[PDB]
Design an enzyme around this catalytic site. Sequence first.
Site, short mmCIF file in Angstrom:
data_model
loop_
_atom_site.label_atom_id
_atom_site.label_comp_id
_atom_site.label_asym_id
_atom_site.label_seq_id
_atom_site.Cartn_x
_atom_site.Cartn_y
_atom_site.Cartn_z
N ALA A 119 0.78 -1.20 -0.10
CA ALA A 119 0.02 -0.09 -0.06
C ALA A 119 0.90 1.14 0.00
O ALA A 119 0.36 2.33 -0.40
CB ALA A 119 -1.02 -0.13 1.11
N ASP A 164 34.35 25.24 -25.03
CA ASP A 164 35.27 25.63 -25.94
C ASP A 164 35.00 26.54 -26.91
O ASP A 164 33.60 26.49 -27.38
CB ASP A 164 35.67 24.21 -26.94
N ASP A 220 37.47 17.80 -26.38
CA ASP A 220 37.66 16.49 -26.71
C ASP A 220 39.25 16.17 -27.14
O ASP A 220 39.94 16.51 -26.38
CB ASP A 220 36.86 16.32 -28.20
N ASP A 229 41.21 15.60 -22.74
CA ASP A 229 40.06 16.14 -22.05
C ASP A 229 38.95 15.21 -21.70
O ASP A 229 38.05 15.37 -20.98
CB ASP A 229 39.23 17.12 -22.89
#
Length: 994
Positions: free
Chosen positions: A305, A351, A703, A707
């Site tokens: 319940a 960036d 990238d 990174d």
Amino acid sequence: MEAAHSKSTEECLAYFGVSETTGLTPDQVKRHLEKYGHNELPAEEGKSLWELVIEQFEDLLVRILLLAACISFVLAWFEEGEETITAFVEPFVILLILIANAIVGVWQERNAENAIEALKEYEPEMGKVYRADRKSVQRIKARDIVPGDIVEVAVGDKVPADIRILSIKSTTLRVDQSILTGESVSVIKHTEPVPDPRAVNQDKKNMLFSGTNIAAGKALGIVATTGVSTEIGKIRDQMAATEQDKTPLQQKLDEFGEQLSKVISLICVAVWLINIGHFNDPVHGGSWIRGAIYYFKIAVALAVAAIPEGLPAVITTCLALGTRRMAKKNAIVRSLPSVETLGCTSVICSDKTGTLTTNQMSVCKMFIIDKVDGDFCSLNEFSITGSTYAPEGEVLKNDKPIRSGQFDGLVELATICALCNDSSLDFNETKGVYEKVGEATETALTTLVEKMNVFNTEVRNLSKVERANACNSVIRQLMKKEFTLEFSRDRKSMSVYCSPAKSSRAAVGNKMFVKGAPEGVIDRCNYVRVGTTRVPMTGPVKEKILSVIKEWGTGRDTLRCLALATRDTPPKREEMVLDDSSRFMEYETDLTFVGVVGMLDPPRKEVMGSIQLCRDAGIRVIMITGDNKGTAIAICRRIGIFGENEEVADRAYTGREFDDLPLAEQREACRRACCFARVEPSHKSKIVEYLQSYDEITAMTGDGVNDAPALKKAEIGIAMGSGTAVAKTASEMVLADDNFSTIVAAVEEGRAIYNNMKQFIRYLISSNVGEVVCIFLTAALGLPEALIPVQLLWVNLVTDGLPATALGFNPPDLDIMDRPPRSPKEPLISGWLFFRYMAIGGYVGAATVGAAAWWFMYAEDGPGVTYHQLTHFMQCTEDHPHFEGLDCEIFEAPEPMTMALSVLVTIEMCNALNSLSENQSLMRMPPWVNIWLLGSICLSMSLHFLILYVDPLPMIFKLKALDLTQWLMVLKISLPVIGLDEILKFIARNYLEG
Ligand SMILES: Nc1ncnc2c1ncn2[C@@H]1O[C@H](COP(=O)(O)OP(=O)(O)O)[C@@H](O)[C@H]1O
Ligand SMILES: CC(=O)C1=C(O)N2[C@H](C1=O)[C@H]1c3c[nH]c4cccc(c34)C[C@H]1C2(C)C
Ligand SMILES: [Mg+2]
């Protein structure tokens, strides 16, 4: 061996006691391999969808529903006999559900590949060494290479470990460190020692990094380091040590589980505190074993319940319906839950190139010297038109087309631009447009000397492909490029040696053509070219030249400039040590300044507005970049990171500036910072860290494996469509189109998906507070349980299941983005919102008990014995208050249970409407706005009906369809909840506001 780049070639052999000629003795390969271990990354830690399922069951609530399944079993009976077919559902339905809920926390709760496991795709299999126990280049398993041994790399090889180059056997050697960076263009290597002990990787130009490819040439070198100790090995190790936190939802959902598990075993001792009166019953009578069994029906009832069991299914649906929805807006979200955390994004570091701007670089202002007499230093300055790489556009002086070659200096300006250039255009036949080949900056130069056309080459009779590199060619006829001295962050320039060819005019010797950053190049000119003459560089001349470069760069044009100079009388061909990159700057001395070109890399048309959108959304944008701090800031204004006039002193930093601060003020600089110029990838991590020390949720682009470490640390790593493989694996979101505004959009979607979640999460819960308070009455007042297990399960899984899901299509606020980011310390239920769901829960826990027992009280066709002390006896061991008659067993009748169930289901369909908005009246917020909530209720009722007249079902639910007089009492006791609700809405609207 750690600082190898900085040791001489001999120092490195002397360090491993190895002969470049012979190589490592098969002894040394032993002792070593012991000292350093194998050249591999540590093996995966492991997973498995069996221990993954076992991990889900250890949870508190899934411990409870499994306990209720244990009790559901110890309630019925023993082992086999014959048939009362119907029975064992209540323990089998839960055990079905749990397995089908554990499973849902897995094969559409993707938990699979990690950027750390990706880093075993750029570690090679095979490498080529020269050991002593042969004489030829024995190829071995990379795994068995080890510090010290001599290695051979040739074009096409993947570099096996971190290697100090020993000698380059080919003409030159070109490595491809894309993986780390992402910048297609290969890099030149040398053997001189980079003598600074703490040099960045960009400057370690006598080193090969494990994972990189040779893109040209062939060399031999010594292994400096292997395994985890190489540059890529260390990035692996940073991501290993990252503590990955759960999202702000799964975190406050987990402390909801604990609060729910604590409440259940608090009511299961509170019911006891009301049945304590049984201690006063006679020793003989009633059912011993039976006494125990009772309290275990309400326990199980109290279990089911207060759950909401659907939740999981609903969430998962909602998130998986979000992913498909953000992918349309170019946001690929990989981690599922990331979509909710996407909603509290506090800060975004992007960036510049490629995300904020379009990387479509083109030159559009340039100047040369006009005349110089004492102080007077006049410039002669033009503009170029055309954003594209296409040789279409014109040169204009005084705002009006001029023929470029009538200016002697413009000839030189183009000569250098063409000869001191390593890139080129190409016409694309498919797209029908020009293509850059190389650096964006250089290709822009190539496009310039096209537009310029300093020799009046016939160009309109050429064809799209032929004309792309037309005039460049003509200039490559004029001078012959012998060798060339590559760029280096170090001296900030580059130069090519050129000799004349055919019946020309140059003579007496050849020239070097330098092209680099200003000051750098300008601080190295003693002469200035004015026309075709030459005159010595003076203060006043220099100050002009700089004043303009400053104006252009830091202006509202935000231009990036190049100085172009020539060494008129270069050193003798046999005087320059072409392998000694350190001496390139001395050869690039005593230059003559020719002139300056400035180019642009336009900010995405989109971003300007998107930035504003984040201003109003209260989320911070930080722009990381490579421009000089001056131009960095100026681009910031132009995209509206800063106002056109405002202070910024302590708001933009550079790489070196930031490093010069002690940690405390670095940490400080991060909550006010907006702009970083010229940074190391190293910093991206430090910045994410600092932002979190402020409980900011951080989106962060980047990238290259460089990174990867920070895309891991950031709550939201963001890779690019065009990005490297590994970078993508390191992120949680990927911009298919690279656009910065794609982030902003996704953050708003995530804002909306969390808002709608806050809703149906409270809805599904709202029921559970009611379903309990109902079974607390049916126990505290001792009647017959108005609702049982197998009914409730249907309601939470299906009855409320469809409406909760359809509440995930709600129309989002028109000021959804005009309010600050939601904290990760916000509780989902608090303040007036607690007492609103303890009322609605205290109302359902009455209406389901009212109308049901009302079949036991005020009913027509049902045994309507008003005040027949249903509290006194459900034992019928006496049967004294009911004299004449022979029927007790009507307490287990289907009809009364069907009165509570029909009350619930209908109130739920009401309360579903009450959820469509938090504080707008159904008067103000019409129930027919969410066409899918109406559609769901529709399908919800046509299931309540289905389980009543398709006979197998109502027999299994223990129910039977109510009469048309038993359908209006429901709507008499149900509907009034939409009225209790509205009162609460217009109160929190009008006396709890300020
Ligand atoms: N730390 C640094 N020190 C000096 N110059 C740098 C540094 N970082 C990058 N640059 C220069 O800045 C230029 C522009 O960088 P940008 O296009 O922002 O790089 P990215 O690919 O990181 O966006 C790079 O081409 C590089 O020549
Ligand atoms: C078998 C399995 O993995 C699961 C489940 O099957 N469930 C959830 C759960 O994770 C349970 C749970 C844990 N914490 C919360 C907070 C709120 C709601 C729920 C839960 C529902 C629980 C249940 C039993 C449906
Ligand atoms: Mg970049």
